[PDB]
Each structure stands twice: as C-alpha cells, then as structure tokens.
Enzyme design. Sequence first.
Site, PDB file in Angstrom:
ATOM      1  N   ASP A   1      -9.566   2.641  17.067  1.00 48.83           N
ATOM      2  CA  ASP A   1     -10.467   1.947  16.148  1.00 48.83           C
ATOM      3  C   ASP A   1     -10.487   0.424  16.386  1.00 48.83           C
ATOM      4  OD1 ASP A   1      -7.870   1.385  15.262  1.00 48.83           O
ATOM      5  OD2 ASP A   1      -8.326   1.623  13.140  1.00 48.83           O
TER       6      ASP A   1
ATOM      7  N   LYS B   1       0.860  -1.175   0.000  1.00 49.74           N
ATOM      8  CA  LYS B   1       0.000   0.000   0.000  1.00 49.74           C
ATOM      9  C   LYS B   1       0.896   1.225   0.000  1.00 49.74           C
ATOM     10  CE  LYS B   1      -4.036   0.148   2.471  1.00 49.74           C
ATOM     11  NZ  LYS B   1      -5.228   0.664   1.746  1.00 49.74           N
TER      12      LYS B   1
END
Length: 237
Positions: A115, A30
């Site tokens: 998260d 990524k």
Amino acid sequence: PSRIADYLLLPLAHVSRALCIHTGRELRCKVFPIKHYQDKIRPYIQLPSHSNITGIVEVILGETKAYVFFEKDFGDMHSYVRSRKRLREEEAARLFKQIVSAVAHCHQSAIVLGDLKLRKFVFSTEERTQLRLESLEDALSCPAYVSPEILNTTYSGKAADVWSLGVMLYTLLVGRYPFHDSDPSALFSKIRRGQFCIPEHISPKARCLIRSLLRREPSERLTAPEILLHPWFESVL
C-alpha cells in the site's frame, strides 16, 4: 473515559489520545484484537529500530487485545507536496531517501508493504524535516501507484513496492502523477505500456533514477537497498 498502563485514553474526532500518567505527555494509541496485531502489525515491531521507521514507542499485549502506542505525526506527504505545488530537488532528495530507507529496512525484514503512497509517510516532528511510515492503517489528486504486473498476472511485491517508490519520486519532483487521464482505459493502458514523460527542469541524475524505478519488467527495476546508493542523492546533499 478510559485507561490502560501508563496512559489515560481520550477521544477523537479508531485511534485515541494517550496521556502518560507519569510525565503528562501526549501520544496516540490504537487498539486491535490481539490476533490482528500478531498477523498484520507485529512484523513492524520486529524491525531493528522500529521506533524510527514507525512511530511506535511501546505496545501492550493482554490476554485479549493489543494496545499500540505511537508518537503523533505532523501531517502526511501527499498534503505536503500538494500544499507546495512541487518540491525542490534538495528537499525532495532528503525526504525521498528517508522514504526509501524505511522501505529498504522493511524489505530486509521480509515485510512487503503493498500500500505504498505519499499518503503513507508522515512527519515525526514540528519542523517537518523527518518522516516516518504510517504503519497502522491511519488537483493531483491505487490507481497511479499501481504497477504493470498485477494487471497482467503472481509477482514479487518487493519490486512492486519499488514501482510505487518511482511513482512517489516522480510525483514530489514533478507535482503530479506520471500516469493520469480522464479515461481509465487510457490510464491502465499507459500503466501497462510503461508510458510517461519527465519534465526538463528535472536533472539528468534525477531523471536517471525515475527511469530505473519505473520499468515494465519488474526484475530490471532497482531494489530499495540499491536505490540508496544512486548518485542523485549525493549530487544535492
């Protein structure tokens, strides 16, 4: 249709497929802008190892951009427990300890996750015995993993992550969330009022743990390092 360093980049269908030009073996890559990496991702690279907690094998920093190469995962923990209704205490304890250890390690390096979900933990191997964190931003069915602090108000965050761990622990043992409702007012009132019920097939040590992770008052919750000593783990493993 592209390449950097040891790797050819193939599409899928914002991550892409990385194929090593020496060995031939397939990873993922990524790309980020270098400054996003510096801020939001470089903290996980600083972990002592790093390659076990996250899946990251190497990153390549240019003048302009950061290419993070990691090993491909074999599916997330939400899909897992959903696929199995719920988990037996033996496996649930194995998997949860890995989850906590990863979190505990992050907390020691000053990383607050924020998260935390079952979604965020993904299997490293085909056998699906070992989990890693999905650190890169990549019917049961926020909300639920959301704690009494943030609704009321600043706060710790590290304790907030232990709340989420408690929700996650409940959920893999039970098969559904500790707080759930059609009416959201009712949902948030039950969060703020710390109001839930544990089933009886859940064992005293396991119930004991869930209770000590889900406390209204943040200071009264265990810390991730404390969690790993709790007797539940040793009672089954």
